[PDB]
Design a binder for this molecule. Structure first.
Ligand code: NAG
Ligand code: CU
Length: 227
């Protein structure tokens, strides 16, 4: 359980969607982060993979604001403290807004994977995962925006998948957090994109998995990494 509390871009903080404050406020502030109804600080499990909830989390609506990023710039997402128990991958996608992200139909967004990190070491099962790298970095993740994509407005879909309960059907816990970015620079690629509801299926090999046993490999879920 947790959420993204702050985003650092080009030397300033953009405050996150504080899901334990703003849903209680009823005139809440404009941010680059999507609003959600996930006030339990919880997840979308396999029952929700073909519902709109998987796209940017339960009940999500676009952020009003968009943050500009320098060409090949960093976006640092700062989480609430991630529990060591919640081992699993950290995955990052962009989808083009083709206009103001604040007005997109989330159900039409087509994501391409720009970064993935999975099982790092398995010397002591359940091992060390991208989620453990996030904890070791004091609960932040750094995303480098590619220089090779067409600039424009994009949703960054940033996600931890916790696998501590994932040996059961629908046990994996997805924690997507979306923010609005203005990608800048000279790129031209329009990578093939995947609908939110086709990212994951509840029987995928990196989704329905016992992490407590020795693992020889881990297949990071979702569509193929764009390079
Ligand atoms: C996180 O930062 C705090 C100090 O603010 C420190 O005490 C902690 O050990 C840091 N780093 C890691 C790897 O946990
Ligand atoms: Cu949890």
């Amino acid at each position: 359980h947790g959420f993204v509390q702050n985003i650092v871009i080009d030397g300033k903080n953009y405050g996150g969607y504080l899901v334990n404050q703003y849903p209680y406020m009823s005139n809440p502030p404009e941010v680059i982060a999507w609003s959600t109804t996930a006030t339990d600080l919880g997840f979308v499990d396999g029952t929700g993979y073909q519902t709109p909830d998987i796209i940017c989390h339960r009940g999500a609506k676009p952020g009003a604001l968009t943050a500009p990023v320098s060409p090949g710039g960093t976006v640092e997402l700062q989480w609430t403290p991630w529990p060591d128990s919640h081992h699993g991958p950290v995955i990052n996608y962009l989808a083009p807004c083709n206009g103001d992200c604040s007005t997109v139909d989330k159900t039409q967004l087509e994501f391409f994977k720009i970064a993935e990190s999975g099982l790092i070491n398995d010397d002591n099962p359940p091992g060390i995962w991208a989620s453990d790298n996030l904890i070791a970095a004091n609960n932040s993740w750094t995303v480098t925006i590619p220089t090779t994509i067409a600039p424009g407005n994009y949703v960054l879909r940033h996600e931890i998948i916790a696998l501590h309960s994932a040996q059961n059907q629908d046990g994996a816990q997805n924690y997507p957090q979306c923010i609005n970015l203005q990608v800048t620079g000279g790129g031209s690629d329009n990578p093939a994109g995947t609908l939110g509801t086709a990212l994951y299926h509840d029987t995928d090999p990196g989704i329905l998995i016992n992490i407590y046993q020795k693992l020889s490999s881990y297949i990071i879920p979702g569509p193929p990494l764009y390079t």
